[PDB]
């Protein structure tokens with residue numbers, strides 16, 4: 127149960143990561159940007175779940191998700207997008223690209239835990 131968490135915000139990565147921990151998810155890998163995310167995925171096809179931000183340099187999350195979905199190794203990888211892009215137009219955009227679950231920032235650590243528990247349960 128290997129998770130890859132991607133976000134250009136350092137404090138966001140903290141919180142997500144801490145929150146995964148509380149849910150019993152400890153095998154967490156981080157990336158700052160899309161390029162690094164992609165690199166890590168490419169080199170570790172055993173990754174189970176992708177959790178990605180949208181807005182970031184060096185390849186945004188949208189481009190990342192499309193790339194991932196296009197790879198024949200990651201056609202069924204669950205993909206959760208966690209983003210400030212709260213408008214439905216962007217939601218639709220993301221679902222069409224292959225995002226499976228959409229969580230909108232900002233959130234308290236408690237709300238994040240609920241919203242993630244909904245998708246991931248405990249581990």
Ligand code: BEF
Nearest residue numbers: 179180181209210
């Ligand atoms: F920079 Be993200 F889309 F919250």
Ligand SMILES: [Mg+2]
Nearest residue numbers: 134179181182
């Ligand atoms: Mg960002």
Ligand SMILES: [Mg+2]
Nearest residue numbers: 138231232233
């Ligand atoms: Mg935020």
